[PDB]
Amino acid sequence: MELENIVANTVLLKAREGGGGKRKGKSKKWKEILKFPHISQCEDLRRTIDRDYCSLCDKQPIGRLLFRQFCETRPGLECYIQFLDSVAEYEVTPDEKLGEKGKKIMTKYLTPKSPVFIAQVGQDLVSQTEEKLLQKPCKELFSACAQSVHEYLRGEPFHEYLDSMFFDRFLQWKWLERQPVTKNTFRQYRVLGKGGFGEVCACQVRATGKMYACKRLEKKRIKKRKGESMALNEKQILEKVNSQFVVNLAYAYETKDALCLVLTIMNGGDLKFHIYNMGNPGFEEERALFYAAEILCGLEDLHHENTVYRDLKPENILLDDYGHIRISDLGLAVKIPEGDLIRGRVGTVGYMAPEVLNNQRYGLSPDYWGLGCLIYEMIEGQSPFRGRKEKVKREEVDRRVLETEEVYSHKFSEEAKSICKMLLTKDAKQRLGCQEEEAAEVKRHPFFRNMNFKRLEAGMLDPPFVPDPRAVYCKDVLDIEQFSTVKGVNLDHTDDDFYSKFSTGSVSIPWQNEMIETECFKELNVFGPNGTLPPDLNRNHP
Amino acid sequence: LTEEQIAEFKEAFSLFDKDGDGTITTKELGTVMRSLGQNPTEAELQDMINEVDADGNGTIDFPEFLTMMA
Ligand SMILES: NC(=O)c1cn([C@@H]2O[C@H](CO)[C@@H](O)[C@H]2O)c2ncnc(N)c12
Ligand SMILES: [Ca+2]
């Protein structure tokens, strides 16, 4: 019934607006769900955890916050924390105020009579920093200083922290982090898309209120298609890639009927929706150029892991709350052995490069063909080789991709037509992006002439479009397609190994970041009167 | 169908039944739809309601909503 489309979007927007409203949308029992263990339950963790400063006090977000809390109880250490915060500010300071903020850092921290002098950074290294300040200072000026600061902190401060209540509290958060991830961890909202081995739906961690996308890979469907290794590979690439421009993995878990990937939710929707369901087809060259640059950066990040994406099409490019994009579905991504070519006729009609359609051996080149397709379609509002909803045989689409020149309208500036034709070169050996410089060749193309890629990769350029946080940029729920049921298929003990390899649970850094972002960390990380031990940290008894 | 799912469906229903009289009117539906940026006519609202309104009294109660959702 038509009302179902309204219910689905009203319910999703209610969840996205911080849940019911209070507790930020956390479950009413969220403090019971995330109740700390008593410290005596953490003994095995205490025994097995590797006491590595860099991991415990910096790269793990909760461990970093707890080490900083410990340091802030010591007057001689809080100065070093202050200095690291000022270095972080300096790293994100525009280049013409760089000199003066560097001067202020110098006089605040690094002179023997500075008000918050940090003595453990070498006077000689300070003088070197002074000298290179006075001659074109750059963003990475204070790295060496920061290094020396961490080198002081990893010794005696680290070892005192390990014996403190703040490390016990870290072990409690680590216990929570490793608890089982199940169906009951989450609540499922409307379906957002269909494909692969299942479907994608909005979902929510019940305890924290944080929204995510849940990609559900149906076990019976995987088994009928013998997709076990493909499912595992998609999970493993998602976990290994850590790029600003690729959707990231926060959880992987199992249900009775499915294996689930829990992924960054992208509330701006997919680029196919923005091309075709936001007024006239396509959008302006400014937008297409920005999205193209970010997609190119995401491709470069994958190719650095020698991973070819192979599935570029507007549906697979998503927009976040800020209007930045990420490449989403990695189900067709493959790691190419160093120096070699792979074979595999995969992808979507109208988006497969000629060397893929012909089942030739290929490397990274299909992704540059796909970038050409994406730019063309963003600007024109149409596939290069298929009319909008043209009733056309896939045989004919293949023929046009292999045989026909794509046609350019007045909507294309000369640079946009140039980059499209160079990326849509049918022979891969002559294709833009497929030369020595790899993505670098694309970055200097005159289409991107006013694109500073360094500032883009550092997130310093504003997207041209910011989505309405109260709008659903997706087809209505009744219009999402659906697989037919899988039939005569039988899950065995023989799949259990595979399931166990897939269902590794929470991903450590995204989980700790979720706890911080939702303020579950701030609200739960409490102590007793005057900072005394609370009962859960008090060894004497519960 | 679990009490869990019933309770969730009840919360969704309360997103429409804003006065809690146990029915969804065309006025209430129109308020929700206009919060989604749509501008339905009174007849469009009546058509959408009528599709769900089984006993024909011109509004949707929770049993009818539940039958639609399950
Ligand atoms: N795999 C993913 O990460 C996502 C896929 N979709 C939707 O599902 C469609 C694919 O079926 C896309 O075009 C989006 O509308 C998503 N929507 C929001 N966030 C995501 N993180 C995805
Ligand atoms: Ca009512």
Ligand SMILES: [Ca+2]
């Ligand atoms: Ca009725």
